A paper describes a structure:
To elucidate the nature of the DCB domain and the basis of its interaction with Arl1, the first 228 residues of human BIG1 (DCBBIG1) was coexpressed in Escherichia coli with human Arl1 lacking residues 1–14. As in previous studies, the mutation Q71L was used to ensure that the protein remained in the GTP-bound form. One formed by helices 1, 4, 6, and 8 is slightly convex and interacts with Arl1Q71L-GTP, and the other formed by helices 2, 3, 5, and 7 is slightly concave. DCB domain α helices 1 and 4 form most of the switch 1 interactions and α helices 6 and 8 interact mainly with switch 2.
Arf1 is activated at the cis-Golgi by the guanine nucleotide exchange factor (GEF) GBF1 and at the trans-Golgi by the related GEF BIG1 or its paralog, BIG2. The trans-Golgi-specific targeting of BIG1 and BIG2 depends on the Arf-like GTPase Arl1.
Author numbering:
A (entry chain B): 17 to 180
B (entry chain A): 3 to 51, 74 to 226
Write the structure that this text describes.
Amino acid sequence: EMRILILGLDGAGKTTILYRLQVGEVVTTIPTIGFNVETVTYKNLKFQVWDLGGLTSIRPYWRCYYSNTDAVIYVVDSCDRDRIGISKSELVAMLEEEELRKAILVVFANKQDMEQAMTSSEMANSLGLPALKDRKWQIFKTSATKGTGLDEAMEWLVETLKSR
Amino acid sequence: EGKKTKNMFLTRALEKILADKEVKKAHHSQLRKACEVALEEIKAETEKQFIEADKYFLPFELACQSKCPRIVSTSLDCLQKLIAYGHLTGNAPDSTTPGKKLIDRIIETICGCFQGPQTDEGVQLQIIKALLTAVTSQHIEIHEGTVLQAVRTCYNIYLASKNLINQTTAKATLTQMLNVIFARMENQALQEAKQMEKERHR
Ligand SMILES: Nc1nc2c(ncn2[C@@H]2O[C@H](COP(=O)(O)OP(=O)(O)OP(=O)(O)O)[C@@H](O)[C@H]2O)c(=O)[nH]1
Ligand SMILES: [Cl-]
Ligand SMILES: [Cl-]
Ligand SMILES: [Cl-]
Ligand SMILES: [Cl-]
Ligand SMILES: [Cl-]
Ligand SMILES: [Cl-]
Ligand SMILES: [Cl-]
Ligand SMILES: [Mg+2]
Ligand SMILES: [Mg+2]
Ligand SMILES: [Mg+2]
Ligand SMILES: [Mg+2]
Ligand code: NA
Ligand code: NA
Ligand code: NA
Ligand code: NA
Ligand code: NA
Ligand code: NA
Ligand code: NA
Ligand code: NA
Ligand code: NA
Ligand code: NA
Ligand code: NA
Ligand code: NA
Ligand code: NA
């Protein structure tokens, strides 16, 4: 019933997150080429969750799937300091798209389980989240390899959908 | 890195099939048998010791031919994960088949799960996903007749589908599939030309 996209640069952890939400396991993955789509249930709204590839050549296809999208989970590698400017560049592009005007944004600072990770604040800055309006959003520290963050982020997201 | 993941997909999918209601019936008995037999081998070889997926296509082909959308979806999703992770290459040609291989038969089975507008919408979606993966997979070599079939099926789903999400997906899938196929053709031409330039130098 509710359409959810998972977006972000390649390697960010989108697919791992996907199956961590669906069946609570760490799956071994390949770089996504064609989309993945799964039914996910967090108590208790029905979710159709889409997982597209973040390779450079696949990113232009993202907007082909923005139609009727209720919410976006945007996943960022907390250890990818070199490329965080690109996640911003892409996050900016997509939130300029008319088909996403009323979509809820949730950022996953992923791979938080690693010591080299940037902080929530530093990342929220570099992604220019404060300058966002009129946008409903929140950033969440996560590790998809472990369990940290997912439940808090989903609960927020779920409440935020209800509320709207 | 050598992976367990292949096995989980194969076995969990088979189990889900065997666990489904309408498969208990004698009406799906062949399917039931196929799945139990396949399982009996994969379990028997996984406690010992590579598992080769190519050998176990029969239960999925049969599941695809089922009259129960649930069975078909589960089958289609498993095939997409199999092809994607490169566990299901399909590089063995059946008898009358050549110049065609197991993979063309797999894509054809996928395409045949679409019977027109009346086809279940979740199965439709599953068909789009699996075809995209198949056609964009760098592992496998697909006959162009099979390519055109993949293409025709997505476009048919796009025309006939009542579900807008499915239509749009079909649309986006066609563009990517086509762009990939052409990119791949141009690159193959490049490699051939390069070899030929190299041979030119006796
Ligand atoms: N340490 C750590 N590694 C992670 C985490 N999440 C994912 N990874 C790893 O990072 C790599 C990328 O994982 P994926 O989920 O396939 O990344 P993706 O976002 O789907 O990337 P694309 O499919 O190419 O768009 C994999 O090797 C994962 O094992 C995490 O939370 N912590
Ligand atoms: Cl268009
Ligand atoms: Cl919003
Ligand atoms: Cl599929
Ligand atoms: Cl047809
Ligand atoms: Cl239907
Ligand atoms: Cl094209
Ligand atoms: Cl020669
Ligand atoms: Mg990265
Ligand atoms: Mg992936
Ligand atoms: Mg992915
Ligand atoms: Mg739910
Ligand atoms: Na589990
Ligand atoms: Na809808
Ligand atoms: Na880095
Ligand atoms: Na704007
Ligand atoms: Na409008
Ligand atoms: Na306003
Ligand atoms: Na919580
Ligand atoms: Na069993
Ligand atoms: Na069995
Ligand atoms: Na063996
Ligand atoms: Na399924
Ligand atoms: Na050829
Ligand atoms: Na749909």
